[PDB]
RNA sequence: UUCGGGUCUUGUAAUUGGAAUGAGUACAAUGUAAAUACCUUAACGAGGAACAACUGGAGGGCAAGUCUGGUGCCAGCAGCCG
């Protein structure tokens, strides 16, 4: 109707959200190895050349 | 053996005259339409085969090939789709040629042997 | 510019008139005379042609190849 | 000024923590006070989506949702415009000690 | 003549190997008043090297999403603008 239930349930969206499980996500190399990964990501494997970096773009 | 039964089935399929199943076979053989009639030995209770034998004598010639499963498998029942036999199960258990289609090689020879000796 | 009420029905149900899966109607149709002649059963259609069996209901034998043509008393 | 605006419904029944109430007087700052049909005078706040979109006045049966932690206050949700109020009186979900007609 | 040798390099792969080693154990010894611990060192101690890095944040300020789904001026977020 006007409202599905009692408004101000004090935690409504948390109570009702579809709780999606976490993923597996193989281990990221953390430390200087993270600098490995990231430096290779940006400055030697140059990915987007036109205009700006646009790094982490929306897939569409 | 039986390499022309496939061929004549395909030729009649070209002209769409296969009395598939049994009811079409009966209605056609009571008429002067069915040319070749195949009933298989692998029929349960043998009443249908017995009736086919009684009727076809009366469109007289028949061929008594057994194992209708493979018959309807390659008699033109279903669809090949990919390379071969793309279906769960299929069969006819009785077939009748009403229209010849093609000719050449083995049309009336083994029918003369089987039905007219 | 309008919200529609649900179509509530005061009607129990009407289902598809299912066709009857008849098991071997031809044995019902024919009659074998001991490995030889074979007779047919209950009529043959003159309006449609030989081989088309007719319908048994009562005081009338009925067509169904050309259904409306033949329904006559016998 | 309807060009600036966003531009036959049915009633809605109370559901497990909300009640029909009759406004007794309209208070300032956008608040209001209503008798709930329990023998109680509660303080209702005019909720959003409601403030200056649809109005309300004294002597109007109107739906209000309670807040589970502080019963003494509540927030009004859904209004009833004088004809399904009679229907509300008819269906008997709320006591008929309060008739409102002009 | 389109090629295409990747001919020279860089990256990306739940493909695939053998190297190297400490956190931990622990012979001992040293270390100490006595000792722990460190500094050495036998033997042990890496495969997903589960021997797993969190904490905040991705509108601006301010580096980073106009991706997905959920809620729908409610819940909430937001130091300020919102
Ligand atoms: Mg407009
Ligand atoms: Mg309010
Ligand atoms: Mg670790
Ligand atoms: Mg956050
Ligand atoms: Mg995070
Ligand atoms: Mg930024
Ligand atoms: Zn007829």
- Annotation, overall tally of beta strands of chain D: 5
Please state the structural category of chain D: mainly beta
CATH class of chain D: Mainly Beta
Strand content of chain B: 5-15%
Provide the domain count of chain B.
1
Work out the helicity level of chain B.
25-40%
Helix and strand element order of chain B: HHEHEHEH
Radius of gyration over C-alpha positions of chain B, nearest whole angstrom: 14 Å
Largest sheet of chain D: 5 strands, mixed, barrel
What small molecules does the structure contain? magnesium ion, zinc ion
What is the strand arrangement across the widest sheet of chain B? 2-1-3
Question: Which CATH architecture of chain B is right?
Answer: 2-Layer Sandwich
Taking the alpha carbons of the first and last residues of chain D, their distance comes to 30 Å
Q: What number of domains of chain D?
A: 1
Protein name (chain C): Small ribosomal subunit protein eS31
Subunit structure (chain C): Part of the 40S ribosomal subunit.
Function (chain C): Component of the 40S subunit of the ribosome.
Protein name (chain A): 40S ribosomal protein S30
Please, could you describe this protein's structure?
The PDB classes it as ribosome. The entry lists the keywords ribosome, translation, initiation factors, 40S, eIF1A, AUC codon, eIF2, tRNAi, 48S PIC, small ribosome subunit. This is part of a larger assembly, with chains A (60 residues), B (117 residues), C (74 residues) and D (102 residues). Chain A contains 2 helices and no strands. By secondary structure, chain A is mostly helical. Chain A has one domain. The radius of gyration of chain C is 22 Å and the shape is elongated. Chain D has a single domain, classed as OB fold (Dihydrolipoamide Acetyltransferase, E2P), CATH 2.40.50.140. Helices cover 8% and strands 33% of the residues of chain D. In chain D, a hairpin with a 3-residue loop joins strand 2 and strand 3. Chain D starts with 17 loop residues before the first strand and ends in an 11-residue tail after the last helix. At the B-C interface, helix 2 and helix 3 of B face helix 1 of C. Bound molecules: magnesium ion (6 copies) and zinc ion. The site of zinc ion has 8 residues of chain C, from loops.
Topology (SSEs and partners):
This is part of a larger assembly, with chains A (60 residues), B (117 residues), C (74 residues) and D (102 residues).
Chain A: H1 12-16, H2 32-44
Chain B: H1 3-14, H2 23-29, E1 36-39, H3 47-57, E2 62-63, H4 68-74, E3 94-97, H5 109-116
Parallel strand pairs in B: 1-2
Antiparallel strand pairs in B: 1-3
Chain C: H1 25-29, E1 30-32, E2 38-40, E3 55-56, E4 61-62, E5 71-72
Antiparallel strand pairs in C: 1-2, 3-4, 4-5
Residues 45-47, 75 of chain D line the site of one magnesium ion.
Chain A binds one RNA strand of 82 nucleotides through residues 3, 7-18, 20, 26-28, 30-31, 40, 44-45, 55-60.
Keywords (chain D): Initiation factor, Protein biosynthesis
Protein name (chain D): Eukaryotic translation initiation factor 1A
Domain S1-like (chain D): 8-81
């Amino acid at each position: 109707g006007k409202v599905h239930g009692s408004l101000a349930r004090a935690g409504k969206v948390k109570s009702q959200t579809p709780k999606v499980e976490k993923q597996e996500k193989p281990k990221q190399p953390k430390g200087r190895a993270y600098k490995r990964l990231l430096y290779t990501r940006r400055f030697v494997n140059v990915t987007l050349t036109n205009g700006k970096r646009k790094m982490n773009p929306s897939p569409s | 053996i039986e390499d022309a039964l496939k061929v004549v089935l395909r030729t009649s399929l070209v002209h769409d005259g296969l009395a598939r199943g049994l009811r079409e076979s009966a209605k056609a053989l009571t008429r002067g339409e069915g040319q070749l009639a195949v009933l298989v030995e692998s029929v349960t209770e043998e009443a249908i085969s017995k009736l086919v034998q009684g009727l076809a004598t009366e469109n007289v010639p028949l061929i008594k090939v057994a194992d209708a499963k493979q018959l309807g498998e390659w008699a033109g029942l279903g669809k090949i789709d990919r390379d071969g036999n793309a279906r769960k199960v299929v069969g006819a258990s009785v077939v009748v040629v009403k229209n010849w289609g093609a000719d050449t090689q083995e049309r009336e020879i083994l029918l003369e042997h089987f039905s007219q000796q | 510019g309008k919200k529609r009420k649900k179509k509530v029905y005061t009607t129990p149900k009407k289902i598809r008139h299912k066709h009857k899966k008849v098991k071997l109607a031809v044995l019902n149709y024919y009659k074998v005379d001991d490995e030889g002649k074979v007779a047919k059963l209950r009529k043959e259609c003159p309006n449609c042609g030989p081989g088309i069996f007719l319908a048994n209901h009562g005081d009338r034998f009925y067509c169904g190849k050309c259904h409306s043509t033949f329904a006559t008393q016998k | 000024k309807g060009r600036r605006g966003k531009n036959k419904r049915e009633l809605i029944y109370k559901e497990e923590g909300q009640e029909y109430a009759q406004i007794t007087k309209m208070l300032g700052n956008g608040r209001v006070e209503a008798s709930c049909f329990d023998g109680n005078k509660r303080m209702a706040h005019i909720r959003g989506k409601l403030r200056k979109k649809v109005w309300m006045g004294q002597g109007d049966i109107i739906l209000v949702s309670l807040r589970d932690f502080q019963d003494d206050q509540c927030d009004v949700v859904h209004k009833y415009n004088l004809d399904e109020a009679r229907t509300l009186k008819n269906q008997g979900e709320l006591p008929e000690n309060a008739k409102i007609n002009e």
